[PDB]
Structures are given as C-alpha cells and as structure tokens.
Amino acid sequence: AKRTKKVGVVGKYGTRYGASLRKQVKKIELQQHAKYSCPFCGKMATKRQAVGIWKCRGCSKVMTGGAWTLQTAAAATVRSTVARLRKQAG
Amino acid sequence: SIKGLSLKKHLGRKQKQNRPIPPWIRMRTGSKIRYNAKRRHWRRTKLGM
Amino acid sequence: LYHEAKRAGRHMGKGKRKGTREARLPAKVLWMRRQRVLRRLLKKYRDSKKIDKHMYHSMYMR
C-alpha cells in the first residue's frame, strides 16, 4: 500500500507548522535522504554524513558537496568554467 | 568521611576542650570558678571547622 | 494450581484480559517466530537437495 495521499516523508511533522513551510521542507528533505552516485567507484551508495559532507558507503571515500545534495548546480557551473579558463590560457 | 589531616586536628582539639573541669580545682584557694562556661553539645551549637 | 488450569486455557476469557492484544503478545514477535520458522524450513530443504537454487529464492521473497 501507499499509505498517505500527498505529504509523504513529512507525515512525521504531523498537523503543525503550516502547509507552505511543510512543502518547502518536503522537496529538499527528499533530496538529502537520497542515495547519490559516487564519482569514484560508480555505485549509488552516497549518504550525507553532515551538512556539506558526503560519504560513499561502498567506496569509503568522503567528499564535499552541498548542504542537501551532492552537487549544487552553482558548483557544477564553476567546474565547467574553470576547465574552459585553463584551456584558453594553454 | 574524607577529611584532611589539618581539619582532623582542629576537630581533635575541640573534643579535648569538652570535658568537665577537675573536681580539685574548685577546692583550691581564692577561686570563683563553678562549672565550665564553654561546654558545647554537638547538636545545639556548631563549629564550622 | 491456577497455572495448571491456565494450561487448560481457563481464566483466559475476554473479561480476564485487561491489556490490549498487542501488549499481551506483540505482532512483531508473532512475525519474527513465523519468519524464522519458514526461513529455517527452506535452508534444510535446500541442503537436503529437494528445493533448487532458483525455487528457494522465489519462495524466500514470497
């Protein structure tokens, strides 16, 4: 069975805090409790040890990342642009 | 109890000052002394030492 | 003597029970017994060479 209609992971927080605030939490709480793919081994076993720290369970390696996802999109843009700036300098 | 040796001796001394005066002392000449003035009961009045 | 009677099942009426069914015997325990019983069965059948590798794993998950 699916055992709630909508609220999902945030049935936890019950009948309080207000539904707009509760939804903001739902979408990024869904991110952080996810497993992500490891860069280094491949296996999708990465968990968030602490805000800004992620550990690949199978691999044993730890790496830095976002608060609530492995790769923040701003940081993905910098990895693109610094690879470009290195190439044109030669 | 878990006292230091200093505090043991201060306690020790004030046992030895808590006894009735000798009987023979009053008998001696020119003495107005009657029963010891400084006697203390361990409940009634306290040391802090 | 009271217990001898209890084995008989007496004094086990609805009136006697003053605790919720879950409190008296948890479903978590009744789950565990069963699931340990059935897993045991399959391992001794597989080591006997009645049940196959492939049939074992299907029965396990059901």
Binding site: V25, G65, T72, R79 | - | -
Partner: protein, 246 residues
C-alpha cells in the same frame, strides 16, 4: 538607569563564544618560499564537520621543506574536494578546483573562495558556505587586482594575495526553514548565547529605550544617528532609508 543587553555583550562574561569542541582556526598555509617560487603538493587526509559553521574543514598534510617532520594545516573546504585528493598550493600551480593560486595568476572571470585581503593574511574573505568572490580585472603590471565580494562591493587587492579556486562547500543551507524553536536552539547553542531575543517593547523603560507605556509601542523614531552614544544606539542605526524595498 540599568545597562541594556546590547551594552552587556561587550563586557564578555556570559556572551563569549562557545569554542570548546571547535577543531582549530581555519586558514591557508603561511606564506613560504616554496609557495612563491613554485608549488608544494598537499594531500587531503580528512574532511571534518567543524561545529558552529556551515562549511566543512579539509585537513591537509604537507611535507616540511627544511626539517624531516610532516606539517598539517586545516583549510575551509572548497566543494568538489575528496579524501585522497592532492591539493597544490603555490604560484606555479594549475588553475583547477582545490588549488591555491595568487590572484594575479588567475585569469579574470575566475570564481575564488577564502581570499586574503593583504599578502600573507592567511585568508579573510568569502569563507562562509556557498559564497565566492569573483575576479573582475587586473592592473597593467599584475601588482593589484579587482575582486567582487559576496555583498556586491568591489575591492582593490594585492595580486600576491591568494585563495582557493572554487565555491565553499555546504552550499544553499538557508533554503530550508527551521520549523521548530528547538532547531533554532540547537543552532545557537554551539555559537554564543544570542537567543532567544526579547523584544525591547515588552521590557520596562529602565531596561530599554523603547519599553514602557500602557500600550506596547515605541514612542519615538526607531531611526537613530551614528553620533548617538552607547545605549541610545538601538533600532535602525544610521539608516539612509526605511520601509519595504520597492
């Protein structure tokens, strides 16, 4: 009379910072010969949650140049930085994420974090989670350099000052709401005791300039001069402008 809890905060005592289980002041490696005539290979050994901040600290293991021993600095970790990675500090290191170049070597448009105001400053600017300072443009020589700060403002800085290439980790940790008072409490326990703040209007007219009155109002302008003394300066200090922005 009576001193306001604004004024009591400088006195020290009970408003000091809770430093005890914090794991060392985070810094860049102190300006060597090796860093300014070439480069020095670090190795990232650990990544650590320092309490009372959003950023991770990388713990980095350099070889000493002069003695046999092995040194250990703790930086603020740029994100995309892993346990086993070589960092390369110094002048003639590549422009890649991790590495600590001087600003004059970085070609403009580069994102930088943990930047030194002066030369050999050890690293003051853009250290908080998610932030960066972007390079705008150089001098003709390469002596001085423009930077754009996380505020907005534009800062002239010496080119022989340095910083880490890339964004500081723990990015975007304000987009959640703390739902509970409890989650605010656990935040400010491992920093100073700044919480919970009482509204000055609730107080009596002893304790605060706003407080008092049979209705709960402020009663003079909330806006106050720069020139006002200790214990006048409450509410909106030296304010150019008030009300909702646009």
């Amino acid at each position: 009379g009576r001193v306001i809890r604004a004024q009591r905060k400088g006195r020290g005592s009970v408003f000091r910072a809770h430093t005890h289980k914090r794991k060392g002041e985070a810094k860049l490696r102190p300006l060597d010969f090796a860093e300014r005539r070439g480069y020095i290979k670090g190795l990232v050994k650990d990544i650590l949650h320092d309490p009372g901040r959003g950023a991770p600290l990388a713990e980095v293991s350099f070889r000493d140049a002069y003695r046999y021993k092995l040194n250990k600095q703790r930086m603020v970790a740029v994100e995309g930085m892993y346990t086993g990675q070589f960092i390369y500090c110094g002048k003639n290191a590549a422009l890649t994420i991790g590495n600590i170049l001087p600003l004059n070597k970085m070609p403009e448009g580069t994102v930088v974090s943990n930047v030194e105001e002066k030369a050999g400053d050890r690293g003051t600017l853009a250290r908080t989670s998610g932030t960066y300072a972007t390079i705008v443009g150089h001098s003709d020589d390469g002596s001085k350099t423009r930077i754009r700060l996380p505020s907005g403002a534009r800062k002239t800085v010496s080119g022989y000052s340095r910083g880490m290439v890339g964004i500081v980790a723990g990015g975007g940790r304000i987009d959640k709401p703390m739902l509970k008072a409890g989650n605010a409490y656990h935040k400010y326990k491992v920093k100073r005791n700044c919480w919970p703040k009482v509204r000055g209007v609730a107080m009596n007219p002893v304790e605060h300039p706003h407080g008092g009155g049979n209705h709960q109002h402020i009663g003079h302008p909330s806006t106050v001069s720069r020139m006002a003394a200790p214990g006048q300066k409450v509410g909106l200090i030296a304010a150019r402008r008030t009300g909702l922005l646009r």
